[PDB]
Write a protein that binds this ligand. Structure first.
Ligand SMILES: [Mg+2]
Ligand SMILES: [Mg+2]
Ligand SMILES: [Mg+2]
Ligand SMILES: [Mg+2]
Ligand SMILES: [Mg+2]
Ligand SMILES: [Mg+2]
Ligand SMILES: [Mg+2]
Ligand SMILES: [Mg+2]
Ligand SMILES: [Mg+2]
Ligand SMILES: [Mg+2]
Ligand SMILES: [Mg+2]
Ligand SMILES: [Mg+2]
Ligand SMILES: [Mg+2]
Ligand SMILES: [Mg+2]
Ligand SMILES: [Mg+2]
Ligand SMILES: [Mg+2]
Ligand SMILES: [Mg+2]
Ligand SMILES: [Mg+2]
Ligand SMILES: [Mg+2]
Ligand SMILES: [Mg+2]
Ligand SMILES: [Mg+2]
Ligand SMILES: [Mg+2]
Ligand SMILES: [Mg+2]
Ligand SMILES: [Mg+2]
Ligand SMILES: [Mg+2]
Ligand SMILES: [Mg+2]
Ligand SMILES: [Mg+2]
Ligand SMILES: [Mg+2]
Lengths: 129, 156, 82, 122, 79, 205
RNA sequence: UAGCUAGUAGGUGGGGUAACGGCUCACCUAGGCGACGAUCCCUAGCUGGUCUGAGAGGAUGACCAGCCACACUGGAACUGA
RNA sequence: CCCGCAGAAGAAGCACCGGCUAACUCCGUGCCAGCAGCCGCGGUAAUACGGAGGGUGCAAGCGUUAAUCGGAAUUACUGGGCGUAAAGCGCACGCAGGCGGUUUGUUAAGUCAGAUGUGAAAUCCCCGGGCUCAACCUGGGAACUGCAUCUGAUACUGGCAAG
């Protein structure tokens, strides 16, 4: 069974980058769209496009810069088998602040730095480097 | 200006109809102290020759590393055959807290402040392989800015 | 009953007394309710040596705490000096 | 490996046995030489290594190497044994202490005297 | 405002008394997984105003029997 | 608690000059400074990393006259203190009272200085201090008392010191025989040949 | 070590306690605990702490201080705040 | 604690030196005697045994033994693996359990934020102070990662309701 859609999405992105695919599509969800927005804002992908009504498909346009993938690494962290929540003081710094960590806070899904500025922790969905 | 130092020299044998043929392998590592490091693995029937071969090899195919103020840019892992290595930037004045081979490559590279450990196998050749890979696979804030299409101030 | 007394701390030949309120039954250096000061009988010049938290002492006395002779002497000294 | 598995039954710490279990975490122990004899070493060595089967104060019957040249041992001789194996003899885990209860120091030793219970010459 | 706990009525046979599981969703000390732990409590309920499976709020009180030191305050979701 | 043996021997073993003699007569004339100590000195096996570190550590320890436990303690304190550990360690060593007197110039050698301190000839802030390990603090005046002021050794030492290079971090008056420890010396003021970093690594393995 | 428990689990009323209470007693109900390890077996005083360790941990509970239990072994109460 | 007296006077050992591991030569023995933490050494030239000289390391101590943690990512939560190295049940069905596509609403258990109370003193750490210095004592902080309660956020996970 599919047991983790966010994880699946991340993997899809990684494989697309590996195989140099221009875009990657998957069943859309609200959490997925939010994650995509965070990625776009932070600049790890070029674009996302949700398309359809009954079963809509999110389509991300991946980002390349010198023949190689912009998203160097991208791991899910809080996975279903083991949820991870951090307090604002325990929020991780990925790649010494270069990479980002998408964190689901009380005020919506946001990057780790933004969450820290706000002053709240939450479920750490994934790290991106 | 291209400071070089030999990590390990090891004698290896091949067997023939007659008896054993001994020979020496020299693992050297050179670097300019500003980022550039290159390792070389020479083999010859006697040690000095082996060392010379290693030095020549090392001198070519060196590799530049984006170093931040005499230390690493972020915590970096490195893997290879067995030698899996972890290395973390540390505050100025800590000095290089790093194993043997690892210490050599880092030192010639020009990193003055690191905390390293070699996990897994500690086979000098492999550990050097791991360390160089790890150092290379490390981008700077300039590079990340370039990749993501932002300014360095937006990233911090 | 609750009392206010010196508790011996320091080294051999160099006593330093912590003034503590404590139930008299308790051992000298044992269980105590509150530590309301200290007194250093070997304190040199250009050193304070004594400090009695007077408000706390007053409160405890009001509550009904008896006072050691030495502590009383110290209190008198603090009062005069201050 | 799965967190669920670990939660159900966590990881067992590897209970390491002692290589000197007759000492029973004592630094030395007294025993009586039941029998003192010589024995042949293990494979790449030739010798007649001196060893004594000792009844310990706590019941155990061990065998103990006797280092140094020459010794004043026999049956019913109370000695102290210490931790340490002779790699060389199979199954010997303990040394006698030279220079204690009923064991003399080695004769004419000028070095490592402390190891062999020998007093300082003058 | 008083301290009170909710729990499902696991049984109600012994008269004037119920047993109330109070599942708490604790985190594991080492592994970090969140495990459901349970705390059965013998609760006193006069009038036997409760069925099995019903969620019910209870408060702590002076001990009423060998094992029974909690009383219910209001029943909810009687199903 | 003290090394009681040949001094030029110590210097020979280290390689460098450790300054264990007054320097009236050159050490090359006083001993075979070129040849290493012992039956087998004229041999140089290639020294391991551990070995090299150890040799340097020995050098510094011999120079100051600190035994191992005390040295280790100094290192621990230095590490604990904020800033650079090696720099801190060197500062502590300099700070030592015997070292300070030697710098001022009342003792020809550090050994001489230590002896004076031991024998109660030196007052720090008008109090006869006896401990060689006594840490002198910044702005501390340290002076020879008058009974030792008559010492011909002390006056000889002063002359020798006048010959020697004066430290910037102290100020010493030869007639008064009193010096003010103005500040703990900086590493640039201390000798460059000492590689304190090796010591730090060795005590950090 | 997979079943354990009859004052056992709960109720009503008496008795008892400085105090609540199967604390005890008479009767009533047939319960209660248990794979989130009951019961049985082995070992063990507990904590602040100590040692170690980058940390997470591991080991440990001498001294000092808090709490508990015992006072030749096993029972019992009296006196008394 | 201070002052005076005399006179270098009363005061240095222990381990180690083949590699790991800082420090090497000669003699004696000849797989014997012996050594050893590991790897090993010794069968007639022993830098590995025993003695001597020399050296190295610690020093009023130095060695040996026991014991714990470390190194040991060698029980791997951080932080391991399972084709051939140890390791995929012979294969299925399936209760408890673990996990759960997508939308909306509600709740607020988890989660997060803030506050209040507590988390004894000693210890640890920081800046000070006192013992000639240190150990030691000591002032003030910090810390005590916790726990409880109350008030908020609805992102996520959970419950309930509808799709
Ligand atoms: Mg007085
Ligand atoms: Mg043989
Ligand atoms: Mg000493
Ligand atoms: Mg360390
Ligand atoms: Mg009743
Ligand atoms: Mg009644
Ligand atoms: Mg017991
Ligand atoms: Mg560790
Ligand atoms: Mg005792
Ligand atoms: Mg009795
Ligand atoms: Mg009575
Ligand atoms: Mg060597
Ligand atoms: Mg011989
Ligand atoms: Mg030996
Ligand atoms: Mg021979
Ligand atoms: Mg050897
Ligand atoms: Mg020998
Ligand atoms: Mg471990
Ligand atoms: Mg493995
Ligand atoms: Mg096989
Ligand atoms: Mg099989
Ligand atoms: Mg199969
Ligand atoms: Mg879901
Ligand atoms: Mg479910
Ligand atoms: Mg809540
Ligand atoms: Mg002071
Ligand atoms: Mg405290
Ligand atoms: Mg929901």
């Amino acid at each position: 069974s599919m047991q983790d859609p966010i994880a699946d999405m991340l993997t899809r992105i990684r494989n697309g980058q590996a195989a140099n695919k221009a875009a990657v599509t998957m069943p859309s969800s609200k959490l997925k769209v939010a994650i995509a927005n965070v990625l776009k804002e932070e600049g790890f992908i070029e674009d996302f496009k949700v398309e359809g009504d009954t079963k809509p498909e999110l389509e991300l346009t991946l980002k390349y810069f010198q023949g190689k993938a912009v998203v160097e690494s991208i791991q899910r962290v809080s996975r279903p088998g083991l949820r991870i929540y951090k307090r604002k003081d325990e929020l991780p710094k990925v790649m010494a602040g270069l990479g980002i960590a998408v964190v689901s806070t009380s005020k919506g899904v946001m990057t780790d730095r933004a969450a820290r500025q706000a002053g709240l922790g939450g479920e750490i969905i994934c790290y991106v480097a | 200006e291209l400071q070089e130092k030999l990590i390990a020299v090891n004698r290896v044998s091949k067997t023939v109809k007659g008896g054993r043929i001994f020979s020496f392998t020299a693992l050297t590592v050179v670097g300019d102290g500003n980022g550039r490091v290159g390792f070389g693995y020479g083999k010859a029937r006697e040690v000095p020759a082996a060392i010379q071969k290693a030095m020549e090899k090392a001198r070519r195919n060196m590799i530049n590393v984006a170093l931040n103020n005499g230390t690493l840019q972020h915590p970096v892992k490195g893997v290879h055959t067995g030698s899996r290595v972890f290395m973390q930037p540390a505050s100025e004045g800590t000095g290089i807290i790093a194993g043997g081979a690892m210490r050599a490559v880092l030192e010639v590279a020009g990193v003055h402040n690191v905390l390293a450990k070699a996990y897994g196998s500690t086979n000098p050749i492999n550990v050097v392989r791991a360390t160089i890979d790890g150092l290379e696979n490390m981008n700077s804030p300039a590079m990340v800015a370039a990749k993501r299409g932002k300014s360095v101030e937006e990233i911090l | 009953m609750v009392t206010i007394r010196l508790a011996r701390h320091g080294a051999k030949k160099r006593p330093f007394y912590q003034v503590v309120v404590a139930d008299s039954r308790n051992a000298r250096n044992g269980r105590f309710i509150e530590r309301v000061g200290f007194f250093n009988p070997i304190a040199s010049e250009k050193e304070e040596g004594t400090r009695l938290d007077l408000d706390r002492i007053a409160h405890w006395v009001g509550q009904g705490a008896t006072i050691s002779d030495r502590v009383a002497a110290l209190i008198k000294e603090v009062n005069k000096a201050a | 490996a799965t967190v669920n598995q670990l939660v159900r039954k966590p990881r067992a710490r590897k209970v390491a046995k002692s290589n000197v279990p007759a000492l029973e975490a004592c630094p030395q122990k007294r025993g009586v030489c039941t029998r003192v004899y010589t024995t042949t070493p293990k494979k790449p060595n030739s010798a007649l290594r001196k060893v004594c089967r000792v009844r310990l104060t706590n019941g155990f019957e061990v065998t103990s190497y006797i280092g140094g040249e020459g010794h004043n041992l026999q049956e019913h001789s109370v000695i102290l044994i210490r931790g340490g194996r002779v790699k060389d003899l199979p199954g010997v885990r303990y040394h006698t202490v030279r220079g204690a209860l009923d064991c003399s120091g080695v004769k004419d030793r000028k070095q490592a005297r402390s190891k062999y219970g020998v007093k300082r010459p003058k | 405002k008083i301290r009170t706990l909710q729990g499902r009525v696991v049984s109600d046979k012994m008269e004037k008394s119920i047993v109330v599981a109070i599942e708490r969703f604790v985190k594991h000390p080492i592994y970090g997984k969140f495990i459901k732990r349970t705390t059965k409590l013998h609760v006193h309920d006069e009038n036997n105003e409760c069925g099995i499976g019903d969620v019910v709020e209870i408060r702590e009180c002076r001990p009423l029997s060998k094992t029974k030191s909690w009383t219910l305050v209001r029943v909810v979701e009687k199903a | 608690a003290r090394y009681l043996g040949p001094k030029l021997k110590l210097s020979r073993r280290e390689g460098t000059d450790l300054f264990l003699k007054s320097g009236v007569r050159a050490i090359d004339t006083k001993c075979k400074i070129e040849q290493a100590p012992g039956q087998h000195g004229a041999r140089k096996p290639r020294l391991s990393d551990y070995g090299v570190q150890l040799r340097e550590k020995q050098k510094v320890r011999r120079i100051y006259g600190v035994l191992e436990r005390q040295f280790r303690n100094y290192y621990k304190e230095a590490a604990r203190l904020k800033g650079n550990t090696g720099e801190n360690l060197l500062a502590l060593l300099e700070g030592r009272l015997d070292n300070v007197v030697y710098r001022m110039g009342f003792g020809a050698t550090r050994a001489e200085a230590r002896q004076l301190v031991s024998h109660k000839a030196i007052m720090v802030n008008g109090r006869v201090v006896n401990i060689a390990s006594y840490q002198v603090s910044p702005n501390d005046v340290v002076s020879i008392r008058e009974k030792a002021k008559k010492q011909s050794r002390v006056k000889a030492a002063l002359e020798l010191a006048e010959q020697r290079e004066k430290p910037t971090w102290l100020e010493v008056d030869a007639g008064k025989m009193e010096g003010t420890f103005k500040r703990k010396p900086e590493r640039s003021d201390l000798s460059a040949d000492i590689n304190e970093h090796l010591i730090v690594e060795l005590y950090s393995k």
